[PDB]
Amino acid sequence: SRAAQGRAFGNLGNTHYLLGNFRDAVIAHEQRLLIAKEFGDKAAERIAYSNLGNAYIFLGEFETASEYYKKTLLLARQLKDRAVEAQSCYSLGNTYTLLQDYEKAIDYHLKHLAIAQELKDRIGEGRACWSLGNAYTALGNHDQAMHFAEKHLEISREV
């Protein structure tokens, strides 16, 4: 059964990933992804993009990771999944920092911030302020950095 194989690949991919077998995680998640597309299973397709992006981070392939996180972001928006939209924006902000593309990093970190505030995810808001302060400082934008450094301090005391 092709559907059972899709489940099995998704499970194998996750286990390889957690064992540090990132190459073999990619091989398995790609087959999960293909089978998800065959069956029109958008939930599984989205999940596979996110797990692929994560594996490529640990393979050091940051541009490839960004391509998979952009795919996850698109699908999360289509599915109206705000928490997953936020997660993929945070992963993109970090990925663009690894690529030393601070303008794109700031874009996606601001997107994550907005959703974390809407969702009352205060811990996530603190992460966003940490990340944004760091990025603005890397660029010399110290008035923006001040705003987010103050907010990181305030949140750091709460959660």
């Binding site: 996750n14 957690l18 999940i47 797990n51 994560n54 981070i57 992963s91 970090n94 920092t97 990340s131």
Partner: peptide, 17 residues
């Protein structure tokens, strides 16, 4: 390394869906 990125990666190593 950027400390916030390091932390994100430490969490990411444990993350699956």
């Amino acid at each position: 390394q950027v400390d916030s990125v390091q932390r994100w990666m430490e969490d990411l190593k444990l993350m699956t869906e």
